[PDB]
Each structure stands twice: as C-alpha cells, then as structure tokens.
Amino acid sequence: QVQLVESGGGLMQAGGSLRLSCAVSGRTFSTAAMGWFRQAPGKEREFVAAIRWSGGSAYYADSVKGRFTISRDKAKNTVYLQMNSLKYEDTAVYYCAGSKITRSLLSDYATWPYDYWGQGTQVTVSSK
Amino acid sequence: SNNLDSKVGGNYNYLYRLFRKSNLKPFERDISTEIYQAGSTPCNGVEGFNCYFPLQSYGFQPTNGVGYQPYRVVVLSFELLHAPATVCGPKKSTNLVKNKCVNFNFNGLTGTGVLTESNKKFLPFQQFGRDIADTTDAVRDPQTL
Amino acid sequence: AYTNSFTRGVYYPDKVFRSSVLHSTQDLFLPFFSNVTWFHNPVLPFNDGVYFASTEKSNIIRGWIFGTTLDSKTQSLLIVNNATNVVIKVCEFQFCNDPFLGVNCTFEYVSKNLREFVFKNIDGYFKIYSKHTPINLVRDLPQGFSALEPLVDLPIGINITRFQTLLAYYVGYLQPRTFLLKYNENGTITDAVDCALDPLSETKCTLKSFTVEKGIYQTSNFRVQPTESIVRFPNITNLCPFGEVFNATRFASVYAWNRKRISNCVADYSVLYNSASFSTFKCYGVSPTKLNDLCFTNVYADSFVIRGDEVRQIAPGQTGKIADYNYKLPDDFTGCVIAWNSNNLDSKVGGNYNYLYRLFRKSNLKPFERDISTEIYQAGSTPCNGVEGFNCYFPLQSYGFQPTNGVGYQPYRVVVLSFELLHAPATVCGPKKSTNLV
Amino acid sequence: VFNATRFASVYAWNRKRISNCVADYSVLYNSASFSTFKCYGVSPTKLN
Ligand SMILES: *[C@@H]1O[C@H](CO)[C@@H](O[C@@H]2O[C@H](CO)[C@@H](O)[C@H](O)[C@H]2NC(C)=O)[C@H](O)[C@H]1NC(C)=O
Ligand SMILES: *[C@@H]1O[C@H](CO)[C@@H](O[C@@H]2O[C@H](CO)[C@@H](O)[C@H](O)[C@H]2NC(C)=O)[C@H](O)[C@H]1NC(C)=O
Ligand SMILES: *[C@@H]1O[C@H](CO)[C@@H](O[C@@H]2O[C@H](CO)[C@@H](O)[C@H](O)[C@H]2NC(C)=O)[C@H](O)[C@H]1NC(C)=O
Ligand SMILES: *[C@@H]1O[C@H](CO)[C@@H](O)[C@H](O)[C@H]1NC(C)=O
Ligand SMILES: *[C@@H]1O[C@H](CO)[C@@H](O)[C@H](O)[C@H]1NC(C)=O
Ligand SMILES: *[C@@H]1O[C@H](CO)[C@@H](O)[C@H](O)[C@H]1NC(C)=O
Ligand SMILES: *[C@@H]1O[C@H](CO)[C@@H](O)[C@H](O)[C@H]1NC(C)=O
C-alpha cells in the first residue's frame, strides 16, 4: 500500500551539498505533513525537517536552520531534501517519514508520531 | 460514533477552525485555510509568530472520554419558499368501507356520505366526478383505482 | 409564415369527471381560429402558455428548453427524449447558441402522426398536456376536435419567459379565455365554444347550450374604451419645505407639539417612502405609493418627540398617557404617521431631560386638541390654588433619554401629517406631470 | 392581588375571586406601572 522510496545522497566532502528524495506511492498526505529523521550511531533518531504537504510551509530543527532546504511536489508525490553546508556532525542515516495526523503547529511534527517511514539512506561527511 | 470514527492511535481526519476574525452568521460555511493573523504583523502566507494555522485536529480514540469521543451530527433545516413544497410526511391511510354513512377524506376532497360501487367510467387522469350543480358524487380511490 | 388554429389546443382544464353536461370554464386556452407562427428553431417568448404541435413522420423534434436567461445564469427547464426514455432536468445547464441533438441541478425525472402539447406554469406548478393523433396531410393542422389530456406536472416553481425547441412545428400563445365544453357520457371533451370568438358563440355561452333557438338574446354590454389619459394639475413649481420639518435641530415637547402649516406647494413623498432613515412609516386612509398622485387642500405637519413604547400610541383610537393627554388623533385620521430613531441627536452622556410629557389631565383630550398650561394638577379633593404637595403634582414629567437606555426608552422623532380636502381648490399636489387636454 | 409578595407559576396560576365590594378602577388605569393594560370586550375608562 504505502511505501517511501528514498534516492540519492551518500558521500560528500565538507562544505558540499546533497539533495535527497522520497517518493510516496499509494497514499496522499494533503492535510498532513511529512518529515525527515536522522540517526547517528550511538544517538537516538532526531527530527530533520518537515513541510506541510498542501501548503508548503516548512519547519526545521534548531541545528538545521539555514543549511537544509525541504520542498515537495504534489504531482510527483515526492518530497525533496536540499542538504547544503555540510557539517561533520550530520553523519547519520536519514529517514523520510510520514504521519497520518494533521497538526496546527508545524513544530508539533518534530515530536508527534509518524506512521510511515523510508528505508534509510546513509550520509557520510569526509574532510577535504 | 465511537466505534466508527475512533480507532487505535486516534483519528485526526476531523478538524475544527481554531481561530477566526468574526463570529459566524447563520448557516455560514467558511472553509478558508488562511493563516490566521493573531497579531498586527501580516503573515503573507508564512507561519510563525502570531501566524497560526486555522484548523486543528480532533482527539477521537476508543479510550477517550465521552466528552471527547466522536459524535456524528446531522442538522435538518426546514425551508419554506415561494415555490411548491415538495417534502412531506407519509400520510398513512385507513380502510375502505362501503354502503355505510362514513365521514371520508380522499386525496384532497372531504365529505360525508355512503360510498357504493359505482359503474361510472372515469378517464385515467380524472380523480373525482361532479354533478350538474358542481357537487361531487363520484371519487376514484387513490390506492385502488 | 402563419396558419390558423382551427379547433386545436383544447385541454381538460381540471381532473374532474363530468358526463353529459355543458361546463363553462375560464382558463388559458388557444383562441379558436387564431394565427400560430409556422416554423421549420429560435427562442420564443412564453407569455402565458404555449400550444405546440409537431407534424412528423420520423421524430425530428426531441425536446424543449425553458427559462428566462437560459445561459447557465439562472435555473432552466430541460426536456429530452432519446429513443427509449423521457428525461426532464432542472439543471442550470450551459446552453449553447444553437443547441440540438445528433442523428446545480434541483430536479431530474426519467420516464402521419400529430403530437400536440400545451405548456404553462401557474402558482409555481408547470403543467403539460398532450394528445397524439394520426393525420394524412402535408400543409397545416387537421380539421376536428381532439381533447388534450394531461401527462406530467412539474413542481419546479421557476420563472420562465423564453423557450426553444430541440432537434416543422407550430407554436400558439394562450390568453385568458372563457370556454364552454361538451362532455359526453364517457366524460371526454367532444366540443367546445370559444366564448368571445363571435356573437353566436357568445350567445351559446350565455344560454349554456350548443343549439340556440330563434329569438333575441342579451349577451353582453357594449362599452367604448377610453382613448387618452388626461392629467391636469395646477402649474406650481414649489417644493414643500419638508426639509424644514424633518431636518429640524430641535423638536417641540409632545404636550406642546408644533403644528406646521403646509399649503401652495408641490410635495415629493417619493423622498419619504424611498428613504431608509425612517423606522415607522404607517399611513391611515392613504397608500404610501399613491401619495404622489393626490391633490390636497391643506396638509398639517405636526412634529414631536417620544420613546419607543409610545410610538404605537400615535395612531387612531389608541389608549395611553400620550394619546390621552398630549396628542389625540381622530378615529377617522387621514394621513401618515412617520417615526425614526433620534437617539444619536437627543441622547447625551448621562441622559437628556429637555423634553417633557404630561402625566395627568382633568379629562380626555379631543382630537387635535392642544393644552400647554402649567397648572398644578389636583388629584385630590383639597384645591391646590397653585400649591404643590399631596394630591398636587406638576402634570409634566421629563423624559430620560440615555445612549445606554433601552430601544423602547430611547428618544424617537415622530411627525404626523394630516390630510384634508377642504372647501377650496386643491393646493398641495404631487409631482405628477400634467398633459394637454382633449 | 397586585402587590402580593410572590406570584404563582403559570401552570398553577393563582385565582382570587373578588366580590361584595366597590371597585375603583381609576387608580388602576391612571397608574403608569403597567406595560400591558388591555381590556377585552370592555373599555377601561367605562369600568367605573
Ligand atoms: C398500492 O399498494 C397496494 C398493495 O401494497 C396495491 O394493491 C395491490 O394491487 C394489485 C394491482 O391492483 C393487485 O394485484 C393486488 O392484489 C393488490 N394487493 C392487495 C394486498 O390488495 C395497489 O395496487 C397499489 N396502488 C398503487 C396506486 O400503487
Ligand atoms: C437517454 O439519455 C439519458 C441521459 O439523460 C440516459 O439515462 C442514463 O441511463 C444510464 C443507463 O441506465 C444511467 O446509468 C444514467 O444514470 C442515466 N442518466 C440519467 C441522467 O438518467 C438514457 O439511458 C438514454 N437513453 C437511450 C435510449 O440512449
Ligand atoms: C363510451 O365508450 C364505450 C367503450 O368504447 C362505448 O361503448 C361501446 O359501444 C359499442 C357500440 O354500441 C359496443 O360495441 C362496445 O361493446 C361498447 N363498449 C363497452 C365497454 O361497453 C360507448 O358507446 C362510449 N360512449 C360514448 C358516448 O362515446
Ligand atoms: C393572421 O394571418 C393572416 C393570414 O396569414 C393575415 O392576413 C393577418 O394579417 C394575420 N393577423 C395577425 C394579427 O397577425
Ligand atoms: C445553486 O442554486 C441555489 C438555489 O437556492 C443557489 O442558492 C446557489 O447559489 C446555487 N449555486 C451556486 C454555486 O451559486
Ligand atoms: C421572477 O421575476 C420577478 C421579477 O421579474 C421577481 O419579482 C420574482 O421574485 C421572480 N421569481 C422568483 C422565484 O424569484
Ligand atoms: C434631511 O437631510 C438629509 C441629509 O442631510 C436628506 O437625506 C433628507 O432628504 C432631508 N430631508 C428631506 C425631507 O429632504
């Protein structure tokens, strides 16, 4: 029924850029919002970025503001994660996530549960 | 409608307008998704400080309280116009008795008399007959013709 | 192209069965021997009804369109018949310039040869009658009498003014004509008489018979109809000073109500009954619209101020303190009483007390009787002789008019126009334009 | 009847039968204490 297919990413140097995708098939999230999550080894999975599917207004975590850019396309049913200005601390497996819940506060999507998730994409930062 | 609109993990399809600039007028349906300007600064379609989404989800779970469990509400409003009134009640009928002085009430015409099996030949569209002096003497029974 | 509506378009006026009786009915019929426009498909008016006859061998015509604008701007009636079923819709359909057929809906229903139909809408009900008959002709309508039985009734309630056919047909228009119908033993309409076609038919109506015996019968009344409309008014160009009376800065106290004389002027009551600045506008013995068409010897303008619950008292035959001791209208009062809210002007922070009303008086006031004396009222036995105290009160009491007062307590400005036709030529006339005399 | 401390509810409306006395309705009619004083089938002034 519902599958989240991530593409792109991998290895990039410090200061470089990557752009991630997540194609959703068999479900639409018009009123809901989709989010991204990352899990560094030895640390819990954390919120990355969420964008309202219908409206396009985007909310970000504190450590990701100004370097990461999320965007979504309703027609293609794929959300993008423009990932610029790499830091070594970003090294983690990024997961595109989906939730069935509509929330007034776009910050609530960093704590509220997600019912759908991607396979996870490894992100590695290398120095020079 | 708890068993129907409440599911494990909650149901968040039903929403409600959380902020609005004015109280609604009778039968007023407002579906605008404008980001509410809570302050004086215009939002310009950007959520943020005093810029909040108008709609918020409902808490409908099986383990919720009765005050918060889902309820299905249907409001029926009766309208009178300058037009034919086309919604009515069933208007059940009674039995048919002949050769006895009864106070009958057919489709629209009422009277008192004895109903007897007549041999007049109405046309299929005709409902009741009249005498030479505009007095109704034959009626076609609405249920059996 | 026009033909002659010989004996066609007679439909059963009602669902009543009558046997061997001559019934006279007044309804919308197609007058006997009238001109019906012959067509081989424009949009035609729907004045009061339409008689439609369609001489066909291959079912060229299919349906009809009805409405007033018929461009998806309002509701419109649509009937289509496609080879097995008849469909009647009331959708606000997007009509083209020349709709046809090949070779916000509020109602939808689905069900050699001469096909006749009569369409009309009365009291909101759209009525259709029809009759199918065989013919052998190529030119015009057949000879004979045929009764159009009802088929379908639409409870649509639609304003309809224009209609159009869908694809040689005939179209005739109904007028309110009296008829006399011949019902046979089986209850079928076999003959009819157009009650105004010709003198012999009118005689048949009057006698309620088809065979009139030799003699002289008085059928109707001859009357020359008028040819011109003569209007003659005195040639005065002088608008009455209604502004001075209605737009006054201050009004008189209801017990000392002002009494304004209006004479020798042209009055424009259209300004009055078209304005939205008057709360109550009630006329006794005259109509609001007809005020401009009348000529009056004198008009009496009376202005005064009262509160909400006292507004209804200013009317003929009313009871209460105001209508009792301040301003009594005669029971046959002929004129209009006008009242509007004056809270904004007569209300000040804390309340206005400048306007008084009388509380006691020795007797009932006569119509149009004005007392303004400031005597002490003796409600008891001991004469006051100008001394107040017990059973000696001042008859007046100041109104309390506050901005926070109730709407029934808030001040109201009321004007009472008194109309008279006295022993004189009319002086106060309306804005009606006079014409030359014939 | 007019100045009683309490009035009964309409479903148990109180009834007082006035008889064997002389009634002065003038004090009732001239008082401005009543918002609705409508005599039916009779005239208030004629009551005396
Ligand atoms: C109304 O319904 C009744 C029964 O619900 C119909 O009565 C039947 O009519 C048919 C045909 O006339 C007969 O064959 C049956 O014997 C009747 N049944 C009974 C129990 O009497 C009646 O015809 C219906 N009328 C209309 C106008 O619909
Ligand atoms: C004539 O046109 C009408 C459409 O107005 C056809 O009615 C449809 O019939 C199908 C078949 O059952 C239904 O599924 C649709 O819902 C009907 N539409 C409406 C508006 O009633 C009708 O079938 C046509 N008849 C012929 C003989 O072609
Ligand atoms: C009313 O209709 C009936 C039926 O068509 C007519 O009666 C028929 O008359 C013929 C000739 O006498 C007979 O052969 C038929 O058997 C009759 N039918 C029935 C059902 O009785 C009658 O003549 C018609 N009356 C009028 C005034 O037209
Ligand atoms: C009626 O039709 C005839 C012939 O078609 C014509 O002579 C006559 O002028 C017509 N009258 C009107 C009022 O159209
Ligand atoms: C459809 O018709 C109704 C008739 O009451 C009207 O009120 C309504 O405005 C119409 N629909 C639209 C979209 O205007
Ligand atoms: C039909 O039109 C008239 C004016 O031409 C209007 O007064 C009337 O209300 C209309 N009918 C309906 C149902 O609105
Ligand atoms: C009184 O003045 C108002 C506006 O100043 C005007 O609309 C109104 O017509 C005036 N009254 C009359 C009787 O003309």
Is the distance from CB of C39 to CB of C32 less than 8 angstroms?
no
Are C55 and C169 in contact by the 8 Å Cβ rule? The answer is yes
Exposed/middle/buried for residue C53 (C-beta within 10 Å: 0-12, 13-18, 19+): buried
CATH number, domain containing residue A99: 2.60.40.10
**Cβ distance of C364 and D44 shorter than 8 Å:** no
Rounded distance, CA C170 to CA C2, Å?
A: 9
Please name the residue of chain A whose CA is at the shortest distance from the CA of residue B11.
Answer: A101
Ligand 4 atom 10: residue of nearest CA: C35
Contacts of B84 in chain C (CB under 8 A): 124-125, 155-157
DSSP B5: H
**Cβ contacts of D33 within 8 Å, gap of 6 or more:** none
Which residue of chain B is at minimal alpha-carbon distance from A31? B13
What are the angstrom distances between the C-alpha of C241 and each of B68, C248, C289? 68, 11, 20
Q: Is D4 exposed, middle or buried (0-12, 13-18, 19+ CB in 10 A)?
A: exposed
Instruction: With beta carbons under 8 A apart, name residues in chain A contacting B55.
Output: 31, 102, 104
C190 touches B at CB < 8 Å:
no
C210: number of CA atoms within 13 Å, CB side? 12
Q: Which residues contact B111 (CB under 8 A, 6 or more apart)?
A: B103, B104, B136
Contacting residues for A3 by C-beta, under 8 A, at least 6 apart: A24, A25, A26
Ligand 6 centroid to Cα of residue B25, in Å, is 26
d(CA C428, CA D38): 39
Instruction: Return the structure tokens found at C20.
Output: 């061997």
User: What are the E-state strand segments in C113-199?
Assistant: 113-122, 125-134, 147-154, 162-166, 169-173, 175-183, 189-194
**CB within 8 Å of C430: residues ≥ 6 apart:** C233, C266, C267, C268, C269, C291, C292, C293, C294, C295
- Tell me whether chains B and C touch (3+ CB pairs under 8 A): yes
Q: Do B121 and C186 touch (CB under 8 A)?
A: yes
Query: Under a CB-based contact definition with an 8 Å cutoff, are residues C167 and C173 in contact?
Result: no
Record: contact C364-D45, CB cut-off 8 A: yes
| SS percent in chain B: helix, strand, coil, step 5 | 5, 20, 80
Q: Which residue of C has its CA nearest to B86?
A: C155
DSSP states along A19-67: EEEEEEES---SSSEEEEEEE-TTS--EEEEEEETTT--EEE-GGGTTT
Distance CA C150, CA C16 (A): 12
Contact C211, C48 (CB under 8 A): no
Report yes or no: B84 and C90 within 8 Å, Cβ to Cβ.
Answer: no
Question: CA–CA separation, D37 vs B115, rounded Å?
Answer: 55
Give dist(CA C360, CA C362) in Å, integer: 7
User: Which fold would CATH assign to domain C2-223?
Assistant: Jelly Rolls (2.60.120)
Question: Quick check: A72 and A80 in contact, CB under 8 A?
Answer: yes
List the one residue out of C422, C178, C398, C207 whose CA is nearest residue C306. Answer: C398
Rounded Cα–Cα distance for residues C352 and C410 (Å): 10
Query: Which residue, among A4, A51, A7, has the nearest Cα to A25 in the 3D structure?
Result: A4
Pairing between β-strand A121-126 and β-strand A10-13 as defined by DSSP bridges: parallel
3-state helix, strand, coil in chain D (%, to 5): 25, 0, 75
Q: Any residues with CB less than 8 A from the CB of C1 and at least 6 apart, and which?
A: C37, C38, C39
**Distance between alpha carbon D1 and the CA centroid of its chain, in Å?**
8
Which residues in chain C have their CB less than 8 angstroms from residue B86's CB?
155
**How far apart are alpha carbons C149 and C194 in whole angstroms?**
19
Single-letter amino acid code for the residue at C216 = I
The verdict on a CB contact (< 8 Å) between A55 and B55 is no
Q: Which residues pair with C175 in a beta bridge?
A: C29
Do C321 and D35 lie within an 8 Å CB cutoff? Answer: no
Decide: B68 and B59 in contact? Cβ < 8 Å.
Answer: yes
Per-residue tokens: C10: 């007679």
Ligand 2 nearest atom to the CA of residue C110, by list position: 21
- D18-26 long-range contacts (CB < 8 A, ≥24 apart) are D23/D47, D24/D48
Rounded distance, CA C263 to CA C15, Å? 61
* Residue C353 CB less than 6 A away from ligand 4: no
DSSP string, C152-163: EEE-------EE
| CA C315 to each of CA C318, C369, C399: distance values in angstroms, whole numbers, following the listed order | 6, 15, 21
> Position of tokens 């009222």?
C377
The phi, psi pair for C203, rounded to 5°, reads -65, -40
Taking the centre of ligand 1 as the mean of its atom positions, its distance from the CA of residue C171, in whole angstroms, is 41
From residue C97, how far is each of C17, C62, C72 by CA, in Å?
A: 44, 17, 12
Amino acid at B24: L
Backbone angles phi, psi at C337, to 5 degrees: -105, 125
Mutate to test the interface with D, among C306, C313, C319 (most CBs of D within 10 A): C319
> Residue A58: which of A44, A47, A46 has the closest Cα?
A47
If we measure between CA atoms, which residue out of A15, A40, A17, A13 comes closest to residue A126?
Answer: A13
Cβ-based neighbours of D11, under 8 Å, separated by 6 or more: none
Which residue from B10, B47, B56 is facing A57, i.e. has the nearest CB?
A: B47
Q: Is the CB of residue C430 less than 8 Å from the CB of residue C269?
A: yes
Determine which helix (DSSP H) or strand (DSSP E) holds A94, and give its type and residue range: strand A92-98
Contacts of residue C245, Cβ cutoff 8 Å, sequence gap at least 6: C260, C301, C303, C415
| CB-CB under 8 Å, B52 with A102 | no
Pairing type for strands C265-266 and C428-429 reads parallel
As a whole number of angstroms, the distance between CA C283 and CA C240 comes to 19
C180-194 b/e (C-beta count within 10 Å ≥ 16 → b): bbbbeeebbbeebbb
Task: Return the structure tokens found at B130.
Answer: 């009249």
Phi, psi of C162 (to 5 degrees): -130, 150
Report resolution in angstroms. Answer: 3.3
d(CA C334, CA C298): 12
Closest to C65 measured CA to CA, from C175, C168, C167, C173: C167
**Min Cα–Cα distance to chain B from A79, Å:** 19
| Closest in D32, D35, D44 to C321, CB measured | D32
Q: How far is the CA of C283 from the centre of ligand 7 (A)?
A: 20
Dihedral (C-alpha) A36, A37, A38, A42: value to the nearest 10 degrees?
180
Give the closest-approach CA distance of B75 to chain A in angstroms.
26
The label of the residue with tokens 């107040």 reads C388
Compute the distance between CA of residue C157 and CA of residue C141 in angstroms, rounded to an integer. Answer: 32
Q: What is the spatial distance between Cα A78 and Cα A34, in angstroms, rounded to a whole number?
A: 10
Residues of D in contact with C378 (CB under 8 A): none
Chains D/C: 3 or more C-beta pairs closer than 8 A? Answer: yes
Copy the structure tokens of residue C186.
């089986």
CA of C160 to the centre of ligand 5 (A): 17
Integer Cα distance of C398 and C407 in angstroms: 18
Smallest Cα distance from D5 to chain C, Å: 27
What is the β-pairing status of strands C10-11 and C147-154? Answer: parallel
Q: Is C82 in the pocket of ligand 2 (CB under 6 A)?
A: yes
DSSP per-residue string spanning C331-386: TT--EEEEEEE-HHHH--TT-B---EEE---SSPPPTT------PPEE-SSS--SS
* A touches C, CB cut-off 8 Å, minimum 3 pairs: no
Residues C105/C90, Cβ–Cβ less than 8 Å: yes
Asked whether the beta carbons of residue D30 and residue C360 sit closer than 8 angstroms, the reply is yes
Within 8 A by CB and 6+ apart from C374, the residues are C394, C396
> Which residue range(s) make up the domain with A48?
3-126
Q: How far apart are CA A114 and CA A116, in angstroms?
A: 6
Rounded to whole angstroms, the Cα distance separating C152 from C147 reads 16
Rg (CA), chain A: 14
CA C332 to CA C309: how far, in whole Å? 23
Residues contacting residue A40 through CB under 8 Å, at least 6 positions apart: A89, A91, A92
If one counts the domains in chain A, the total is 1
Residue among A60, C123, A58 nearest B82 (CA): C123
